[PDB]
Amino acid sequence: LDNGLARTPTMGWLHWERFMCNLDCQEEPDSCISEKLFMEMAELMVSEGWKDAGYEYLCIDDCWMAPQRDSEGRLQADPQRFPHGIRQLANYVHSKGLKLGIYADVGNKTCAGFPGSFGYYDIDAQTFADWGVDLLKFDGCYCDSLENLADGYKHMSLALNRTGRSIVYSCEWPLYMWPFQKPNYTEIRQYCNHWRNFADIDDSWKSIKSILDWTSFNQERIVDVAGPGGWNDPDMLVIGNFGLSWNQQVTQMALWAIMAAPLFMSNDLRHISPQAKALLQDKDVIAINQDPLGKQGYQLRQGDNFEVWERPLSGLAWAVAMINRQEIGGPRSYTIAVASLGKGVACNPACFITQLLPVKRKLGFYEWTSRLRSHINPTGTVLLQLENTMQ
């Protein structure tokens, strides 16, 4: 989308995976979808270094709204759970120097069954701008017409534009299109700042694997359409929760950097390990993801339960990810000629290789004819940065 936004992949926090549609503030007050949750999450984003690292957008997902629209036919937030309204939540979020994301649906209802935006595209978009919203995530449920889906996503894109407010437009267009046709990504890129391609992530290694495998299987379709202002969205970062081992967390962080993915954490910033925090806040890994070239990486090799992904960065630098998919035994050795990496351009005539994950370690100078030798933990990833040098 040519709105001057998402020149790098969007970074922030989104409630969905960790909090979902918990409406029970009486028995589960700490995990219910409330203004207090977002207020407190915004406080920690500042005080715990998240904003400084680049996580700017505090995002509301589904189940924020009242059962029906008001007397003006406008969306309203739940009166019990958001008694002070979205406008005051946006003011609070902005005062902490952060940006606010909200959620709506192209169809007649949201996925969780609250009021949909079909027939209300122009007022909803204006409503959000009036409330001071900075990002919209726009879902695809309860729209069974291929035409309506496309027209709706297109309509809402222009409906937001016409408010004059800078609002990041997050689309689930391609995901809800697959059931009918192969999505036109040129068309989607024109209207959307980023786009969900694949099934919802959950808190599991199974889910990470299936997202990676779908991406690499479909990479000839989707890699090259990604760029400044339009990104593929492989879904939320789930580091800091319950389902991934440390190595599986390393794999998600490394690969979301390779894929030029929007980085939306879905976790509890009030209850998160120092180890998970350090990984999510890793400035070198975040710098790869946020690389100004804005060129998405890809799978270079697959075989013997190994994967090699790489990503071109600005200034003739490359990020290289090596995954060990064998889920038994111990660390496995992997060797590759550095001439195979970066299309033979990285490391010509030399490169300086620095390991970034699982730990940061300088590996040294590698000549063009040399071999890189590494060891990778089961379900882990080794992430390397290659700096092209004359030395």
Added chain:
Amino acid sequence: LDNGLARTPTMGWLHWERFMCNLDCQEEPDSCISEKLFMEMAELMVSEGWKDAGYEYLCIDDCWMAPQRDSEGRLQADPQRFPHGIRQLANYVHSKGLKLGIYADVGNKTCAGFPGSFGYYDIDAQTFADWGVDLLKFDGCYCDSLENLADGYKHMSLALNRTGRSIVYSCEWPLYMWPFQKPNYTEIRQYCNHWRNFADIDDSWKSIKSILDWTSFNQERIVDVAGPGGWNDPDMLVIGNFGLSWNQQVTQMALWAIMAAPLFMSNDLRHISPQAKALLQDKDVIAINQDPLGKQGYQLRQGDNFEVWERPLSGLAWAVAMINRQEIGGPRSYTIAVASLGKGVACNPACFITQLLPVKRKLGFYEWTSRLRSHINPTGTVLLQLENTM
């Protein structure tokens, strides 16, 4: 098996899952299957408090053997990887106050393709005893019939007894007959100290789940046969490795205790996190696994992606495990009437409840009328001990 052994589930370390069949001592001298690897673990078992916690058997799995038998038709350890031989290794392990486990196969070859014991059961049993072996894991590969399977497991069982040496006998009998015929567990227990029921574990949560699921599905068949001298074996503890989250490691530890399962760690004792070590050495959880009554727990309930398991213990106590199988969202609330626990006796008229996992916490007194409420992490387990008040 009535040999006076495995009166509680066996506890130890077994190389298979973490170290496998690594024969590459040239490129990987520190992780290949060698005498040295077993010496390193033996030393850490003593020095890192593993032995003090109950882990007594240091066990060699597959891939210890030389490609062929010796001049006298006896099994031999690989000459380059086990230069001093097994008797010498057993000497060393014994001097550390530990016990040595080894591996053989009922068929014509081991699963990795080394010499099988078929046709040599008495020879092999006697050489094992002469070596000072303390435990035998007896696998089921390359056995061409069910009759040969049964006959061989029986034969070796009696052949070990005849040696006069106390040797814990670990059988994979039910696993290899399951695809064809349903096992007779009364028959298996008569001949075996413990028995592998299900597919090899690996370093994954998927694996823990399928083992748990198989066990609860088959529990009517397997629960009651378990007891002192004869245990169900759901395979190795894989805590301390790579594929399990903290909560999934908790689930494995908690449920292997509920299940009165043998506790064979398969990990690297040289590179293990303090967190993993403290869980594996958890005194109170081990004490549940090791409960002298030796009655296997079972799944009490499942629904809304929760499972409840319980186990009767000595002195009218019960262990209770609550698993959250929902792999999305946050810690999730679960409640149960304490009157539904322990067959209605645990908390009549009252019980004191102590949480052991994920952390230790006294929960207080619960009346017959009470409800237990708990938040359980996704893929995690809450493990509690209930003491009847009298």
